[PDB]
């Protein structure tokens, strides 16, 4: 505890004799030119001082030590170790100040894409997208990161991860009222899920959400779209979702607020709704 | 996009570099005789060019470079690396040209089974069958591949995978091929689950399928097999499927198509179809006279 704060003090001292190691780089390696292993052990003490900082809960100091160790170690050699150190620095910076974590993670992304390891790069892309979402407010950069990660995943036939990423992207775009992309993604994912016997039970929800998105833009073509969904999948009308949508669309033909109000209240009386659906219905049904 | 065009430009540059490198290596082997490092580094250049080329989103030449690098590598008595590169090239060609992908995948399968790995060979056989049937319209070669994969799985007591492969083979055969093999496979798999840990209540459906197949053959075989199963598996006595089958049998006995139609409609109303039972039931109804 407190004595571990004293030992984090002597760990700043450890970084200080690492500074003496770079002073060796300045003057003494002229006679110790073969001491590349000396630089290696300097990097090791760098990393371990960073670990003592981390245990000491000094996130800024631990991240600084990690970044310095990565920079010293990335002497055009042992690149993967530098990437590990950079991602460790990014994880340390996740809490407290995460901004520079973004830059270090981007550098690691470049290193990995240079190596070709696309699963790690894409999961790091998801990480930066989610830290943007939870910490910052920008969504467009998150959307681009999600698209890039889904592209990498789909490159190696990793279909499910790309499907979930595209589902999130379509949800966000619908929140951002760009319905063409949302309907495209939802139709794609639904028609893919219905393909195999493991996911055919999900298709109903995707089709319902795509139907709502299409209905948002053009009332008239909504009937044709729902008919197309029904004929394509004979087992869709039975689902309560299709019946409810039919009730809402037929009620909209006549200007009766009640009809759909009690329709939605009755539907909610069997189960609670989420923010997305409630907000979408409130926005759309206003007119 | 700049990324693409740059990636293709440097890929062409690297391919030319690798070609001149291999030619200069042929020259140097006699000129200096440096061993084989030249060829190995040329193969490394080829692999880096091919991976950044598939990364450029262009596939066919990527797989071609993979195949060339694997060929030159196997030229130096290295097998497993060349076979892995073969597999990667086949995966790349999957979306470019089915024929070359199939060829490279068969090469990988033969060389692996020569090594002594069956499960990888069976997995590649299943992938070959999947690609063959999904886009190319044909079954018999797919049936053979599935049978081979199941055989290799059973060779290492992989009961579940072989069971699934044999069930799929029997289903396809019943769809198109004759029924005796379907009868045998379905009955064997169903009776091989009487003591399943989780699937104690599974074999029922299989037997029903068998029954249908038997009924597809003749009425007498249908009833005799139905009884045989009735004694063999007591629980099937109280299955809804048993009553449905008995009702259909007695209705078809008297030649009242209306009874059969109403029975099948009532079953569909209770339970949704599967798109495989409906075809067989339609074929049965076709022969009511």
């Amino acid at each position: 505890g407190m004595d571990t704060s004293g030992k984090q003090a002597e760990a700043m001292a450890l970084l200080a004799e690492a500074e003496r190691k770079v002073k060796n780089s300045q003057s003494f390696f002229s006679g110790l030119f073969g001491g590349s292993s000396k630089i290696e052990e300097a990097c090791e003490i760098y990393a371990r001082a960073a670990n003592m900082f981390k245990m000491a809960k000094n996130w800024s100091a631990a991240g600084n030590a990690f970044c310095q160790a990565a920079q010293l170690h990335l002497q055009l050699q042992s690149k993967h170790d530098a990437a590990t150190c950079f991602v460790d620095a990014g994880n340390a910076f996740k809490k407290a100040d995460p901004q520079e974590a973004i830059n270090c993670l981007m550098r690691a992304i470049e290193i990995y894409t240079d190596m070709g390891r696309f699963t790690i790069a894409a999961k790091h892309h998801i990480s930066i997208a989610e830290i943007y979402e939870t910490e910052l407010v920008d969504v467009e950069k998150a959307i681009a990161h999600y698209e890039q990660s889904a592209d990498y995943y789909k490159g190696e036939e990793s279909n499910s991860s790309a499907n979930k990423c595209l589902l999130k992207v379509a949800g966000y775009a619908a929140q951002l009222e760009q319905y063409q992309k949302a309907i495209d993604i939802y139709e794609q994912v639904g028609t893919s899920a219905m393909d195999s016997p493991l996911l055919k039970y999900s298709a109903k929800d995707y089709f319902f959400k795509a139907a709502l998105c299409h209905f948002c833009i053009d009332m008239l073509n909504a009937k044709l779209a729902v008919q197309k969904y029904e004929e394509l999948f004979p087992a869709f009308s039975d689902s309560r979702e299709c019946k409810l949508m039919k009730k809402l669309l037929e009620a909209h033909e006549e200007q009766n607020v009640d009809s759909y109000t009690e329709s939605v209240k009755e539907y909610d009386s069997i189960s609670r709704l989420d923010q997305w659906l409630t907000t979408m219905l409130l926005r759309i049904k206003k007119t | 996009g700049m990324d693409t065009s740059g990636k293709q430009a440097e890929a062409m540059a690297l391919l030319a570099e690798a070609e001149r490198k291999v030619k200069n290596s042929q020259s140097f082997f006699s000129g200096l005789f440096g061993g084989s490092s030249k060829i190995e580094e040329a193969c490394e250049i080829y692999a880096r060019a091919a991976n950044m080329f598939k990364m450029a989103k262009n596939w066919s030449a990527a797989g071609n470079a993979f195949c060339q690098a694997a060929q030159l590598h196997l030229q130096l008595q290295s097998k497993h690396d060349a076979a892995t590169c073969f597999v990667d090239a086949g995966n790349a060609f999957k979306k470019a040209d089915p024929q070359e992908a199939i060829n490279c995948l068969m090469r990988a399968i033969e060389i692996y089974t020569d090594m002594g790995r069956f499960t990888i060979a069976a997995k590649h056989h299943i992938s070959i069958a999947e690609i063959y049937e999904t886009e190319l319209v044909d079954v018999e070669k797919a049936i053979a591949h599935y049978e081979q994969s199941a055989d290799y799985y059973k060779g290492e007591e992989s009961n579940s995978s072989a069971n699934k492969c044999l069930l799929k083979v029997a289903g396809y055969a019943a769809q198109l091929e004759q029924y005796q093999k379907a009868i045998d496979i379905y009955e064997q798999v169903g009776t091989s689950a009487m003591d399943s840990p989780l699937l104690k209540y599974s074999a029922k459906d299989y037997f029903f399928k068998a029954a249908l197949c038997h009924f597809c053959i003749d009425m007498l075989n249908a009833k005799l097999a139905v009884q045989k199963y009735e004694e063999l598996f007591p629980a099937f006595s109280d299955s809804r499927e048993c009553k449905l089958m008995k009702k259909l049998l007695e209705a078809h006995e008297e030649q009242n198509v209306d009874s059969y139609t109403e029975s099948v409609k009532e079953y569909d109303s209770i339970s949704r179809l599967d798109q495989w039972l409906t075809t067989m039931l339609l074929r049965i109804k076709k022969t009511i006279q």
């Binding site: 990793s158 499910s160 991860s161 996911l199 039970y201 999900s202 069997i270 | 497993h80 892995t84 997995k123």
Partner: protein
């Protein structure tokens, strides 16, 4: 009383279904992942066996 009991039954059944569907999706993801990890493991095993044996033979 039976009416409200059946209301409860409906609610519980549909809730269990909805959550289980995602349970199955998760299990499918697990299965999907495991084959890739297996392939990587086998590749490293082969590479290590061949490399170490070649180095030992060269040592002679």
């Amino acid at each position: 009383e039976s009416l409200e009991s059946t209301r409860r039954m409906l609610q519980l059944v549909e809730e269990s279904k909805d959550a289980g569907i995602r349970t199955l999706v998760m299990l499918d993801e697990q299965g999907e992942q495991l084959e890739r990890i297996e392939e990587g493991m086998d590749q490293i095993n082969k590479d290590m066996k061949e490399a170490e044996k070649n180095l030992t033979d060269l040592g002679k």
